[PDB]
């Protein structure tokens, strides 16, 4: 997502919804990455999810993760979550 | 600039094709069939030049398989024959005693030679040995 | 090569002569000009072996026109071989003698033909029957001089029904080229005798014993009834051509039968099954069967009126059968099977054959025009097909709607609204003109007719002559009907069609329209926007004169093309 563009947030949400309205991509779990986590205008990990209504994705395993492009914090947690969602073993 | 080049056999089968114009596939397929019919319906003393749809289609077959081209009506005609002869010599030298069998099986090499020699309908290298060295260097890279 | 072959063929060992003959036969088959050694193979002709004489005869026949001069060294061999006790050798000699197309050889061949004409051997008589016709084809006057017609006529009066059939075929061939002077026709006794051998003739002999009756004409109902009583059993023959010949003979004989008797109904009921069974023949015979049904359907349409399901095209049917199936269905289209025809045509519009799609659209239009009880269904089907967004389908449907509106436009005002926004970007000249004509003629239910004509007025000077004329007519009609919103459009059309328009007919039409507009615009309503009379539909039924002669020509090339037998032969 691009939380730094308010005028493009609606377009990004519409694009995500159109891409989420396909009958071929069903096994692909949702992976929301909060990019551009360096400006004070960026929202939290729940305001963006509430605006996009990620909870209204039936049969979709979504997970929001805030990653800082300049530093790199939160990338490892997102990778671990993706690995846990893909593999269902020890 | 050469609009297209089509290596076709005497039986009508095409062994090579390279068109420099963005045309539809059905249109391209019809054009190829019409060219094969016109060339296949011509004698041995037709001057090896045909003005098909305002395009000087020149044909010069050195074997059972013939060759064809499509140059705009703004350049010389013998230049196309010289370019065809140079390409045939380069193809013979790169492979070694080039024959019909090596063309169907080695069409990938012929396409690479054509790409390294003629680009966009225009020529890329006037010499005959520098192109061979460049092709050998590209192939030896793995 | 050639020298070695000649040396081998000029040897005394038969083991080399047979091989040389085989090589000579194979070289000619392989496409080799072996006519140069014609005089060299002539020496090795009179041989006791029968496997070698046939090859020599075949080479001589195939090498007869090329070297007529060298062919004079074979008459003695034919004369000597025309008396061998073995019937096979005599038959081969008789067959090879007539095959030689030499003018200086056929003169001396009359004596062997006369000797073999009354031969006891049936194979020899059968061969001589064809040889007489072959000789008469080359020299017509020679056959008359030799007096073979009298001998040919008595052959029908003899046993060996295969020989009788061969003689009948030869007599028919001779009479066909004859100018009809001294016809070989016979009284009912000869017909009865031929019928008595018709149940004994072979598969090919039946067609010969059936074509002769195709020229005779009965004079009473009793003779016709008796002839039909024997022609009926021919409907159960495995040969698809024998069934066709029997059907043609029955149709010809039905021209003298009386419908008041019960024989006409029985003949009609016993022939539908034969045509139905013919529809299940080989794919090549399918075109011939369809042509025969079409040629018979215009004469007696009460026979196959209930046969509609068997006219449905199959998925594996050939293109030449698929095209004829639509025509057969259209010729048999009625109100009883209108729904079935519409359903079959709808499935034919989902195919990939562009010619097949155009034929299906034309058949649907013809069915809608022929029957007015299913016009609404046809219009709905056309609208649904147009809604599928098919370029060829849309182009065909435009012409179909244009044709339907011209015939029954009284209650076609509820379809113009859907056709108003119909992807008018189609560039087909046969569809743009139809759409323009429909808009101009039906410019009452379309509230934006003036706005739609603007897109077609951009290139009216370079669109086409028919398109330009249709646009000029539509603009004039719109101006006459509604001159408030089309006041400037008429002036613009007059200026573009009379000033920058170089079409002679188009220029004349524009000048006439301008003169009518400037003379009396009120009279233009009764002059141009007048009620045209009923449009006479193009009748697909052939003329009764050609159909009567077409009935006699059944199963020949004159029936498939539906053309006269004298308008196609050369």
């Amino acid at each position: 997502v691009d939380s730094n563009d308010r005028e493009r947030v609606n377009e990004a949400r519409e694009e995500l919804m159109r891409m989420l309205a396909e009958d071929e991509l069903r096994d692909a779990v949702l992976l929301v990455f909060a990019n551009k986590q360096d400006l004070p205008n960026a929202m939290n990990a729940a305001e963006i999810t509430d605006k996009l209504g990620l909870h209204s994705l039936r049969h979709r395993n979504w997970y929001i993760q805030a990653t800082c492009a300049t530093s790199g914090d939160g990338l490892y947690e997102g990778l671990d979550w993706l690995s846990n969602q893909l593999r269902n073993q020890k | 600039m050469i609009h297209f080049i089509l290596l076709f056999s005497r039986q009508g089968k095409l062994r090579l094709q390279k068109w420099y114009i963005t045309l539809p596939d059905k249109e391209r397929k019809k054009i190829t069939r019409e060219i094969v019919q016109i060339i296949l319906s011509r004698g041995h003393r037709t001057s090896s030049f045909v003005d098909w749809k305002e395009l000087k289609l020149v044909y010069k077959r050195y074997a059972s398989l013939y060759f064809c081209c499509a140059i705009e009506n703004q350049d010389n005609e013998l230049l196309t024959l010289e370019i065809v002869h140079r390409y045939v010599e380069l193809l013979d030298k790169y492979f070694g005693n080039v024959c019909e069998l090596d063309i169907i099986f080695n069409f990938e090499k012929a396409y690479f030679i054509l790409d390294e020699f003629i680009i966009g309908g225009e020529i890329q290298e006037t010499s005959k040995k520098i192109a061979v060295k460049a092709i050998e260097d590209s192939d030896m890279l793995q | 090569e050639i020298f070695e072959l000649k040396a081998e063929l000029n040897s005394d060992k038969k083991e080399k002569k047979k091989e040389a003959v085989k090589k000579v036969i194979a070289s000619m088959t392989v496409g080799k000009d072996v006519s140069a050694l014609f005089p060299d193979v002539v020496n090795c002709m009179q041989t006791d072996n029968l496997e070698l004489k046939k090859l020599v005869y075949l080479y001589l026949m195939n090498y007869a026109k090329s070297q007529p001069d060298m062919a004079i060294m074979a008459v003695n061999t034919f004369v000597k071989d025309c008396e061998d006790p073995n019937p096979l050798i005599r038959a081969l000699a008789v067959r090879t003698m007539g095959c030689i197309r030499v003018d200086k050889i056929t003169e001396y061949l009359c004596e062997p033909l006369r000797k073999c004409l009354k031969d006891e051997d049936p194979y020899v008589r059968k061969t001589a029957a064809v040889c007489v016709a072959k000789l008469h084809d080359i020299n017509a006057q020679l056959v008359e001089d030799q007096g073979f017609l009298d001998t040919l006529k008595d052959l029908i009066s003899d046993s060996n029904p295969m020989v009788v059939a061969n003689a009948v075929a030869a007599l028919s061939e001779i009479a066909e080229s004859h100018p009809s002077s001294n016809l070989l026709d016979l009284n009912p006794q000869s017909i009865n005798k031929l019928l008595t051998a018709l149940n004994e003739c072979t598969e090919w002999g039946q067609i010969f014993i059936l074509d002769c009756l195709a020229n005779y004409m009965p004079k009473d109902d009793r003779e016709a009834q008796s002839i039909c009583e024997r022609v009926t059993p021919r409907l159960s023959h495995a040969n698809s051509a024998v069934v066709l010949s029997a059907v043609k003979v029955l149709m010809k004989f039905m021209e003298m039968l009386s419908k008041d008797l019960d024989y006409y109904g029985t003949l009609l009921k016993k022939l539908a099954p034969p045509l139905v069974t013919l529809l299940s023949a080989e794919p090549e015979l399918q075109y011939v069967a369809l042509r025969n049904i079409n040629l018979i359907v215009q004469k007696r349409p009460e026979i196959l009126k209930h046969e509609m399901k068997v006219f449905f095209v199959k998925y594996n049917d050939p293109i030449y059968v698929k095209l004829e199936k639509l025509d057969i269905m259209i010729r048999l289209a009625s109100q009883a099977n209108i729904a079935q025809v519409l359903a079959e045509l709808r499935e034919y519009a989902t195919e990939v054959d562009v010619d097949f799609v155009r034929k299906a659209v034309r058949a649907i239009g013809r069915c809608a025009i022929k029957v007015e009880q299913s016009a609404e269904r046809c219009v709905s089907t056309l609208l649904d097909l147009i809604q599928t967004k098919v370029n060829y389908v849309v182009q065909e449907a435009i012409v179909v709607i244009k044709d339907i509106f011209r015939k029954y436009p009284n209650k076609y005002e509820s379809v113009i609204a859907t056709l108003c926004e119909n992807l008018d970007s189609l560039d087909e000249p046969e569809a743009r003109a139809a759409m323009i004509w429909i808009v101009g003629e039906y410019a009452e239910r379309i509230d934006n007719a003036d706005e739609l004509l603007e897109s077609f007025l951009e290139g009216f000077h370079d669109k086409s002559t028919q398109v330009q004329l249709q646009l000029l007519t539509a603009i004039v009609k719109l101006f006459l009907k509604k001159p408030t919103e089309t006041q400037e459009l008429v002036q613009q059309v007059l200026s573009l069609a009379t000033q920058d328009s170089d079409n002679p007919d188009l220029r004349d039409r524009g000048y006439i329209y301008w003169r009518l507009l400037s003379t009396d615009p009120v009279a233009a309503k009764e002059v141009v926007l007048a009620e045209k009379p009923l449009i006479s539909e193009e009748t697909d039924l052939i003329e009764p004169t050609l159909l009567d002669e077409l009935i006699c020509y059944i199963g020949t090339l004159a029936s498939v093309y539906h053309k006269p037998p004298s308008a196609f032969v050369e």
Binding site: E22, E24 | - | I25, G31, L50, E51, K54, L55, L58, K65, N86, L88, R95, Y123, V130, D137, N160, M162, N166, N199, E200, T202, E203, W204, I207, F208, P233, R234, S236, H237, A238, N239, S240, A241, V243, S245, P273, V276, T277, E282, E284, L285, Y287, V288, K309, V310, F312, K314, Y315, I319, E344, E347, T350, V352, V354, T556, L557, V560, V569, E570
Partner: protein, 415 residues
């Protein structure tokens, strides 16, 4: 009235030619190939061509086109019948119809062509009779050709007298995409292989509806054969008079009669198929096969062809019974079943991939065709009653026959 019976090839070479009248130049064949190429590339190709005033009417064989030139208004049906008889003779003499025999059997091919037709009129076409005067490995012609009986050579003697019959059924079904059956015709075919001594005069008797009505037994199960086409051996006058089927069977296997009647009964196999074709994503094949035939009969080798996408790839088959194979050569789902008991119901759920990029041209919807072959099952209910084997010498024949039910034009229109 053919002018020259020739044999062509797949490259335009005339394998064999045999002119019968000479009214057409031998060089006219060279224009047949270009004319055929022009006709096929414009949708106007036909088996009967036209080179000026010369017509080229011919059929297509396995590897050759049997073209026969003509100039006058000849009977095209006669030419087609001659071509069919020649094809049958070639099949009877040579086990294969390909170029390997045309260039190898020229010694006997020329003799067969010369003997078959003279001046454009065929005179002898019986392969069994023709095998006695023209051989590839000559005495006087047999009297059978001159005699009226030209389909049964006299003097045939066998140790036993066995006549094997074959009542082969042909189930043709034309089911529209709406779910209704349009063309449902059954074409009977009694093919017998007679092996007897002498010249027997078989007197075949079945349970015909017309025969039962004439006798007065029009109340039991009688086949209502709309069309009955007997062989050349069957006497037409006897059948027309009182439905008497009397004919002398030939020596070997041949088609005696070919029944053809419509059927108003429910289909033996009911195929409920669905297509869940996602747009460029995937597709589903909810195909259900319901056997409406009797449970006592088993349809050997059930093969219901299901036309899948031409560009389908990565296929998966979730079926119930029978092997499911995807054949890319034919571009269809071959639902192959070895044994299908009557009343059985096999359910299949297909699932295949599809490229993201759309195709350039439409592909059409070929109809689903089943290949069921149920032995010992007569759908029309026709049962053979008697076969009067009469011989002058006098012998006790042992007639035999079997009933085979298969699929004919058993196609099903798709959605």
């Amino acid at each position: 009235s053919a002018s020259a019976v020739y044999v062509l090839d797949l490259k335009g070479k005339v394998l064999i030619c045999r002119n019968y009248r000479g009214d057409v130049d031998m060089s006219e064949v060279e224009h047949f190939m270009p004319i055929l190429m022009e006709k096929e590339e414009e949708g106007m190709l036909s088996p009967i061509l036209a080179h000026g005033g010369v017509r080229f009417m011919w059929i297509k064989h396995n590897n050759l086109y049997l073209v026969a030139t003509s100039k006058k208004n000849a009977c095209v049906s006669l030419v087609f019948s001659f071509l069919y008889k020649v094809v049958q003779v070639f099949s009877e003499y040579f086990k294969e119809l390909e170029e390997e025999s045309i260039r190898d059997n020229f010694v006997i091919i020329y003799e067969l062509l010369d003997e078959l037709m003279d001046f454009g009129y065929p005179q002898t076409t019986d392969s069994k009779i023709l095998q006695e005067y023209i051989t590839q490995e000559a005495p006087r012609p047999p009297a059978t050709v001159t005699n009226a009986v030209s389909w049964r050579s006299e003097g045939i003697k066998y140790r036993k007298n066995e006549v094997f019959l074959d009542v082969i059924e042909a189930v043709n079904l034309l089911v529209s995409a709406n779910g209704n059956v349009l063309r449902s015709e059954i074409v009977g075919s009694i093919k017998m292989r007679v092996f007897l001594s002498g010249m027997p005069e078989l007197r075949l008797g079945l349970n015909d509806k017309v025969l039962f009505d004439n006798t007065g037994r029009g109340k039991s199960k009688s086949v209502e054969l709309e069309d009955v086409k007997f062989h050349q051996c069957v006497r037409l006058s006897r059948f027309e008079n009182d439905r008497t089927i009397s004919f002398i069977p030939p020596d070997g296997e041949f088609e005696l009669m070919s029944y053809r009647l419509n059927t108003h009964v429910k289909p033996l196999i009911w195929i409920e198929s669905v297509i869940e074709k996602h747009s460029h994503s995937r597709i589903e094949y909810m195909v259900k096969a319901k056997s409406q035939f009797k449970r006592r009969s088993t349809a050997n080798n059930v093969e219901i062809h299901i036309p899948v996408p031409n560009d389908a790839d990565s296929p998966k088959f979730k079926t119930t019974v029978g092997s499911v194979k995807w054949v890319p050569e034919n571009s269809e789902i071959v639902w192959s079943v070895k044994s299908f008991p009557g009343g059985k119901e096999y359910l299949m759920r297909a699932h295949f991939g599809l490229p993201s990029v759309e195709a350039e041209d439409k592909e059409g919807k070929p109809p689903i065709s089943v290949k069921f072959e149920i032995p010992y099952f007569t759908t029309s209910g026709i049962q053979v009653r008697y076969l009067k084997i009469i011989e002058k010498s006098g012998y006790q024949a042992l007639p035999w026959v079997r009933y085979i039910t298969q699929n004919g034009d058993y196609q099903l229109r798709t959605q």
